[PDB]
Amino acid sequence: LEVRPDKVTILAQAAERAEDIDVLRAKAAKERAERRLQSQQDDIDFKRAELALKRAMNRLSVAEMK
Amino acid sequence: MASLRDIKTRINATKKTSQITKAMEMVSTSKLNRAEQNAKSFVPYMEKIQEVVANVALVSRPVKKTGYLVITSDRGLAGAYNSNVLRLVYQTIQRHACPDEYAIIVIGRVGLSFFRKRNVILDITRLPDQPSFADIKEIARKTVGLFADTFDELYMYYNHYVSAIQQEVTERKLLPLTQEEILDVLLPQYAESLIYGALLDAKASEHAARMTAMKNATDNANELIRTLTLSYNRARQAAITQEITEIVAGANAL
Amino acid sequence: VAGTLRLDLAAYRELEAFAQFGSDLDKATQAKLARGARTVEVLKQDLHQPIPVEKQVLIIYALTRGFLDDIPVEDVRRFEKEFYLFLDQNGQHLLEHIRTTKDLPDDLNKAIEAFKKTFVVSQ
Amino acid sequence: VAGTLRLDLAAYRELEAFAQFGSDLDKATQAKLARGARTVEVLKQDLHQPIPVEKQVLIIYALTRGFLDDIPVEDVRRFEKEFYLFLDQNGQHLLEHIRTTKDLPNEDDLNKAIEAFKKTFVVSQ
Amino acid sequence: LTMAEYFRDEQGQDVLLFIDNIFRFTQAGSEVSALLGRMPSAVGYQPTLATEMGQLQERITSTAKGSITSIQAIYVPADDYTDPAPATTFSHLDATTNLERKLAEMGIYPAVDPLASTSRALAPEIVGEEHYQVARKVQQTLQRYKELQDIIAILGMDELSDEDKLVVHRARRIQFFLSQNFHVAEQFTGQPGSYVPVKETVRGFKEILEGKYDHLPEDAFRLVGRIEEVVEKAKAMG
Numbered sequence: 188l189e190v191r192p193d194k195v196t197i198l199a200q201a202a203e204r205a206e207d208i209d210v211l212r213a214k215a216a217k218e219r220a221e222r223r224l225q226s227q228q229d230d231i232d233f234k235r236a237e238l239a240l241k242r243a244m245n246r247l248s249v250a251e252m253k
Numbered sequence: 254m255a256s257l258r259d260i261k262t263r264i265n266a267t268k269k270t271s272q273i274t275k276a277m278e279m280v281s282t283s284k285l286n287r288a289e290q291n292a293k294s295f296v297p298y299m300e301k302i303q304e305v306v307a308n309v310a311l312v313s314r315p316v317k318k319t320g321y322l323v324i325t326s327d328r329g330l331a332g333a334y335n336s337n338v339l340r341l342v343y344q345t346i347q348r349h350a351c352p353d354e355y356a357i358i359v360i361g362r363v364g365l366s367f368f369r370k371r372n373v374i375l376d377i378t379r380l381p382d383q384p385s386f387a388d389i390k391e392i393a394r395k396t397v398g399l400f401a402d403t404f405d406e407l408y409m410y411y412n413h414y415v416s417a418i419q420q421e422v423t424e425r426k427l428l429p430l431t432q433e434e435i436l437d438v439l440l441p442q443y444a445e446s447l448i449y450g451a452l453l454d455a456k457a458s459e460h461a462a463r464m465t466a467m468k469n470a471t472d473n474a475n476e477l478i479r480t481l482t483l484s485y486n487r488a489r490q491a492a493i494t495q496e497i498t499e500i501v502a503g504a505n506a507l
Numbered sequence: 508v509a510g511t512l513r514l515d516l517a518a519y520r521e522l523e524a525f526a527q528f529g530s531d532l533d534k535a536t537q538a539k540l541a542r543g544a545r546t547v548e549v550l551k552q553d554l555h556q557p558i559p560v561e562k563q564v565l566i567i568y569a570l571t572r573g574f575l576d577d578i579p580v581e582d583v584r585r586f587e588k589e590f591y592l593f594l595d596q597n598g599q600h601l602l603e604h605i606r607t608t609k610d611l612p613d614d615l616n617k618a619i620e621a622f623k624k625t626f627v628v629s630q
Numbered sequence: 631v632a633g634t635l636r637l638d639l640a641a642y643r644e645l646e647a648f649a650q651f652g653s654d655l656d657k658a659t660q661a662k663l664a665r666g667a668r669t670v671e672v673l674k675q676d677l678h679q680p681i682p683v684e685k686q687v688l689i690i691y692a693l694t695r696g697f698l699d700d701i702p703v704e705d706v707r708r709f710e711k712e713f714y715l716f717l718d719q720n721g722q723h724l725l726e727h728i729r730t731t732k733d734l735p736n737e738d739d740l741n742k743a744i745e746a747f748k749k750t751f752v753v754s755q
Numbered sequence: 756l757t758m759a760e761y762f763r764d765e766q767g768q769d770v771l772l773f774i775d776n777i778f779r780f781t782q783a784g785s786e787v788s789a790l791l792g793r794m795p796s797a798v799g800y801q802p803t804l805a806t807e808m809g810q811l812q813e814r815i816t817s818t819a820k821g822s823i824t825s826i827q828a829i830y831v832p833a834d835d836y837t838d839p840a841p842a843t844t845f846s847h848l849d850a851t852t853n854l855e856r857k858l859a860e861m862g863i864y865p866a867v868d869p870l871a872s873t874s875r876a877l878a879p880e881i882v883g884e885e886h887y888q889v890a891r892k893v894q895q896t897l898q899r900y901k902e903l904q905d906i907i908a909i910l911g912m913d914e915l916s917d918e919d920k921l922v923v924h925r926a927r928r929i930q931f932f933l934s935q936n937f938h939v940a941e942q943f944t945g946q947p948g949s950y951v952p953v954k955e956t957v958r959g960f961k962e963i964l965e966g967k968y969d970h971l972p973e974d975a976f977r978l979v980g981r982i983e984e985v986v987e988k989a990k991a992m993g
Contacts, residue, residue: 198302198305220389223390230654232531236528237328243266243269246262248477272525276529279534417909505794
């Protein structure tokens with residue numbers, strides 16, 4: 188808590204305008220958790236990309252040069 | 254010498270390569286200008302920490318220097334973004350002491366890849382969210398990073414960010430020299446804070462280093478065209494010359 | 508309405524080599540694609556079904572002014588289809604000026620007169 | 631046996647724009663890869679060393695059922711030399727049935743299958 | 756050509772000979788060659804190609820009396836600069852005016868590309884340092900502004916290295932001051948058009964390259980004559 192005569196700063200690792208209950212910020216710490224793991228797409232595009240990059244290189248884009 | 258239809262196969266291969274390359278450059282350029290968004294969004298929290306950590310006039314050198322924290326990506330095609338950091342790490346470990354001592358935490362497979370075969374591993378991090386690094390599951394690493402203290406005095410290894418793609422690798426250090434007296438709460442929230450910032454600047458580099466490495470390839474691939482366009486024309490010529498010479502020489506025979 | 512048509516289609520040709528990698532769809536480069544993929548739809552025509560210039564310039568108008576843009580590609584083709592009839596009944600006066608003058612100096616009326624349709628169309 | 635030999639070899643020629651990803655997450659497809667990379671070793675033969683059909687369909691059998699997988703890709707060539715001598719001695723019955731009838735189970739199933747357990751289980755590292 | 760040579764030798768003038776697509780010529784060349792039953796040469800080209808081209812060009816020059824300058828629109832064969840057809844032509848070339856649709860889209864006419872369109876006359880030995888210096892420089896300041904196109908979409912027009920921002924600024928005015936008033940254009944424009952000697956054109960550039968103009972708006976040097984005209988183009992009146 189930064190208490191200044193003219194201002195109050197609340198540092199929070201995690202803060203969500205939430206109800207009386209706390210066992211919500213956990214709820215938000217929940218519905219956000221795996222819904223951040225679900226971000227395999229991040230990984231999987233790059234796969235498909237590292238894929239294409241090694242399929243245009245498959246034809247050995249140079250056969251003994253030429 | 255060589256073919257023609259074997260010179261086409263190469264052109265088109267190169268072309269589809271440049272395509273895929275330049276794709277990702279733009280794609281990784283789209284992940285630089287989202288690094289700020291989560292870079293900015295962290296600007297305040299940092300300000301209002303050093304402002305708190307103003308330091309009363311009323312844990313200094315304890316014993317040793319031990320563990321590191323080494324920031325990377327999981328994905329490749331980043332230029333040297335990986336090898337570099339994974340060099341300083343490997344140097345100032347073996348430039349350090351040479352027992353199985355001096356322990357380790359890594360972010361991103363590519364790091365754990367080298368670190369693994371070499372030995373001295375402590376933790377793991379995989380699947381960081383890319384331009385939006387989830388401040389959450391790095392919070393689990395502050396815990397492991399601190400609670401580990403089994404430890405003394407860690408250093409963090411990663412690449413910084415200056416202006417789009419230009420960057421350099423660093424060792425800023427951390428776990429030393431910069432109710433009442435609550436350090437039990439600032440010590441932790443001051444590491445969670447640093448290990449995080451380290452990422453944002455690490456990633457900012459990653460995307461950048463990739464944004465570029467995916468330009469170098471595009472640019473280079475584009476030159477592979479010139480080198481082939483030339484050899485295609487030449488083989489386009491000798492071919493149309495042989496065909497004709499064949500068609501006449503077969504007429505004079507009549 | 509033809510001058511800009513080449514543009515929108517131009518960029519889209521130099522751009523839409525990238526979608527699958529566009530999983531990160533970025534910039535406003537998404538906007539160029541936007542009506543771009545839509546113009547293509549408008550450029551797709553039936554067979555054995557010619558289109559008179561009158562009600563042609565109007566559809567080549569719609570998308571190029573955004574009066575199309577609020578409609579997804581799924582519905583672009585089956586839009587211009589009744590936007591014709593909608594005209595053959597209610598703009599039958601408008602498309603006339605298009606005939607007898609081969610001009611649209613129109614710009615004002617159609618601009619509003621195009622809404623008369625989207626504001627009654629299905630989805 | 632030679633039938634699936636095509637499939638195994640097929641994928642390997644075709645999964646091989648994939649094997650980079652390796653494990654990152656490639657799932658059941660490093661599996662089809664495993665014996666793939668093994669099978670090539672099987673299709674490897676040394677100059678001036680003709681192999682009779684009988685025992686030939688036995689090694690082209692072992693790998694095509696897993697009997698060669700518990701062994702590393704870089705130990706396959708040795709496995710041929712090996713499992714074959716010990717066929718020439720250990721067991722002998724299935725080494726020319728495949729000849730006589732020249733067809734079919736070569737030992738019903740259980741025999742071959744378990745007789746393949748014979749030499750595997752007796753081999754080296 | 757013949758009609759031209761007249762005015763060269765009889766009236767000792769310097770006459771222009773335009774040939775729109777000199778490839779048609781060489782193409783007709785191999786085209787005729789066949790009919791006469793000639794055994795084809797590299798790529799079905801009349802074996803007598805070099806010769807037929809050599810005789811067409813050599814008859815184009817400056818005599819002790821007159822001169823004949825030829826502008827031949829070379830339309831190169833399938834984008835291949837090695838094709839015996841163009842490749843032959845190029846040996847007869849003393850210069851190139853490369854027109855590009857780009858510079859046109861921006862509103863620079865003539866559309867002559869400043870870095871592509873080359874020439875043999877550009878040389879100290881010929882035009883002295885003065886011309887060669889400024890001229891070789893004005894090209895440099897362009898191939899700078901051209902490459903920074905990538906970095907400008909990166910670090911933007913801010914703090915991109917001030918030794919560069921000066922380039923980007925000066926360069927814009929320069930490629931703008933390459934556009935000129937064409938008399939022929941007066942038909943539909945109304946501005947009478949320009950004729951600037953090399954002398955004039957050297958100064959206007961050297962001065963701009965000294966930055967003596969960096970304080971003036973872009974749309975100044977865009978379609979004008981002598982540098983002095985750009986200056987008068989600064990009276991926005993009232």
